[PDB]
């Protein structure tokens, strides 16, 4: 269908991939750093979801450079993807409002 709905879909699939890759890379970057908690996959995945949604619980976060880099990619992909949906919903509303104006 329309570009905005495809982009939304694409963004979602992409986000889910970043989430998974992010979980795997966080563990890899963090293991080896004393005091690190982002070291098992199940919670790292919870961490990536937390991060991508910016929910801010603060129960887990990276302590290494590479882990922080992985964090930036994840949050940014999350902010962007959700902003994309917002933009897609606006395109939907703007298009329907034009119709409701018989023009």
């Amino acid at each position, epitope marked *: 269908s329309a570009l905005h709905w495809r982009a939304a879909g694409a963004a979602t699939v992409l986000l889910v991939i970043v989430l998974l890759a992010g979980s*795997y890379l966080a*563990v*890899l970057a*963090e*293991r*080896g*750093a*004393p*005091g*690190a*908690q982002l*070291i*098992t*996959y*199940p919670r790292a995945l919870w961490w990536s979801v937390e991060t991508a949604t910016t929910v801010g619980y603060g129960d887990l976060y990276p302590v290494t450079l590479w882990g922080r880099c992985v964090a930036v990619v994840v949050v940014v992909a999350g902010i962007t993807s959700f902003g994309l949906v917002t933009a897609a919903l606006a395109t939907w509303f703007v298009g329907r409002e034009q119709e409701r104006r018989g023009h």
Partner: antibody
Amino acid sequence: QVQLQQPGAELVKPGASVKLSCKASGYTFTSDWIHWVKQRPGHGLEWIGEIIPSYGRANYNEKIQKKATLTADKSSSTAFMQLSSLTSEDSAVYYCARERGDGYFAVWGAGTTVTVSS
Amino acid sequence: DILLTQSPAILSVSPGERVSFSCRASQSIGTDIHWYQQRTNGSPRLLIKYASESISGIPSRFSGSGSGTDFTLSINSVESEDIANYYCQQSNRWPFTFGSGTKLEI
């Protein structure tokens, strides 16, 4: 069947250096980590280090003198541990274990009794 | 590093009694503790993961409890086959660490 296989023993002369092996079998995920644990007679379990085969990245217990080096042959599903310049202090049973990246060692090898002696 | 204290080091129980092994961490670690059993000259065997989750193939008389810094591994009605060393292990913070262990004695 036996998921981890280690040679029962290895004899090493002081200053020498042996390479222990750990052949794995059963379900193999990319997320698997192989750990190595040292147990001196009488004493308890001491974590040595870890390695993730699907990347070759390894980490070591930095609280103890570093005498190990880990590598892994993805082809033959085998983990290797290179111990170098051993002394009487390095004689003990070395276990290897498999961790599915979720924090616990589900399965351990039978362990290799390394004896450093002339 | 996270210190895992197992005290007392030796437990003397009578056949059939209920025994309780203790594991105290130096800092809070949720329920990220795991229990292993090691018999004379055998290798470690996972008995309980994440503080209280039973593992398949382990006698129902084995259980664990606790969270934070105090953990307990309990055995309802001990028996000769249970004679061994019991270690706790933590996966909350890097690196993983093991308690010093407690020997069960009947």
